[PDB]
Write a protein that binds this ligand. Sequence first.
Ligand code: ZN
Ligand code: ZN
Lengths: 359, 359
Amino acid sequence: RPRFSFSIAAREGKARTGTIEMKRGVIRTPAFMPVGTAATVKALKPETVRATGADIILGNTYHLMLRPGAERIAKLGGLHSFMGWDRPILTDSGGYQVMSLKQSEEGVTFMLSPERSIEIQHLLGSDIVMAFDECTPYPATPSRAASSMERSMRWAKRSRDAFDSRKEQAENAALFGIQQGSVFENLRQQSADALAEIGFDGYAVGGLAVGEGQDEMFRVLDFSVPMLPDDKPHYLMGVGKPDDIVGAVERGIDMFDCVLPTRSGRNGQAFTWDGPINIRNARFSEDLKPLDSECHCAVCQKWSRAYIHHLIRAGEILGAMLMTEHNIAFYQQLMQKIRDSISEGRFSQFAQDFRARYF
Amino acid sequence: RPRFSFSIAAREGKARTGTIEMKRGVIRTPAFMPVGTAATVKALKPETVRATGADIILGNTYHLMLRPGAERIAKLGGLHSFMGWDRPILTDSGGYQVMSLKQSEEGVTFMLSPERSIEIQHLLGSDIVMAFDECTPYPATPSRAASSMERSMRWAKRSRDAFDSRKEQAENAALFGIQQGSVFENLRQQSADALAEIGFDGYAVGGLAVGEGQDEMFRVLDFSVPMLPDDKPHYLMGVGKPDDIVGAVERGIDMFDCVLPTRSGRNGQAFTWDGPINIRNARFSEDLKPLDSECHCAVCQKWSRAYIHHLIRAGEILGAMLMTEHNIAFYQQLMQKIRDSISEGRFSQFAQDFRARYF
Ligand SMILES: [Zn+2]
Ligand SMILES: [Zn+2]
């Protein structure tokens, strides 16, 4: 297996399905990445994450640097060893926290800079390294957006140099750049242009899912994703709801991460093919059906809504475990159905069917 | 398989090892019963509980009556179906809450009476039904102890009549009586005498583990357990720490339940053959050894102290899951070692070895 390869097996319009080959394994695209910010996918064993179908998971530079520390994890053998996941791991750079949570051209003191970010991600043993950026807040005036975008592009250049400066990293991991530019077409193009001239193994669409509404997110995607090199993966960061994912794949996105399936699970929100449900609602107190009647996950093969209703209302940890396993399995099943319909040339129909049923 | 059979395969002094056969399965004794008060063993799937070696688990009349309700569980097919455990289930009667949390000869209003308790346990589909009692608080004067003990014996008689009055229950489940009498020899004897004249499938030692100290608990056991019919199981309620269990088996106890392995797990306390440890302590932050170097559980085969240290300090649910799985597996391994050494006639040596190492 090589450091990094991306092969497209099939297309339908802008939608693509294929595979990313990396040393630690293969990634089926379009791909959903469960998030596991504290060196765990919340409430789940990595075996369980894998069993649900995930090919890769996401970790985070900002949180791990704080606890337990990147150096400490390095000393303990790296993130894979530490949390017991031997498959690829993508780590975010901290660029979202730069928005989510004293800044200057050098970096941000919470101290994270392009160089420190890339080093921390090296200490973790990340397989896919994200460039250190600034997620531009929304709304933003064209001026702010531009100035923000330009700094990230300078930061993307330093991230590259930093990555390239470390042999073990350069030879064994991959580096993705992140496009900014808010909702502005010319800024997005300038950003894509800068990123491609620098050169990355993959390209993320950053700066969305920051409060703009799905309509506006899809508009921006319409013009932004074709700006990215067609022959590399396209990652839409932090997205999203099932319908967000479907619409984004329709516009050229290959990769996703989102806290929804895990967070929603713990909160008692379950995704179904008929739409999301709040299992705490009293209508489910004696519902013997599974969370979803077609879902193939172990939860839905064994436990009833009624049981998981009680668990969640009682604040039982098993409730969190079961909801989370189902939600992530659901998300992976969605990704499988998307992959299959694109391979078979019926993704357009699937997407319509799905929306008709989901909504 | 019969409604209930207890066979002793081997003895060593007062210690016995054997098997309880019930319709839903076989129970190896001396046995440890994980507790699962809210229709779950906290942080664990029943598969996982079973994998650790448990033959039977404990549920509770008081809590289930409150949430989700006994009638509702009955309507949903019974506790086994509801929580996904098809092996025997023992349910406590509520007698501890009578002490732990307006009373009269008829019962206790929190309304639980011998009759309601037995009916609720019938609604749950319990395999081993506990008589409704009053756990006498400690310390107690001889007068109070006696009056308390006498009421429970009257309540034990009504529990029997109630159980016997329901065909499906009488033919498919078993009923255990519970000895009271505080720390007083004559009261304990009067209680054992009353219980045996009524007649039960098994006999519990109640009223201990109420603050009296292990020395005094073992003293009372010394004279109380031979008062119980030798040919039926002897259950020490709510006990206990590993060393408590070993000393109690040395004095004739066949069954145990305790919240320790689960509660302690969530709190970050791990049992080891060298004694309990507080995994949150900073000495473990970079400890690559498993929780215990000889433990056979999946946790100890895959994860390090360092990892579980981080998980617990970070308030991650997986930390609770992993600690709990280990703790319960540990308890079951202890029970297996006790069974094996009694079968082999070396339980005395084991007990000494264990204490030498544990302390
Ligand atoms: Zn499911
Ligand atoms: Zn273990």
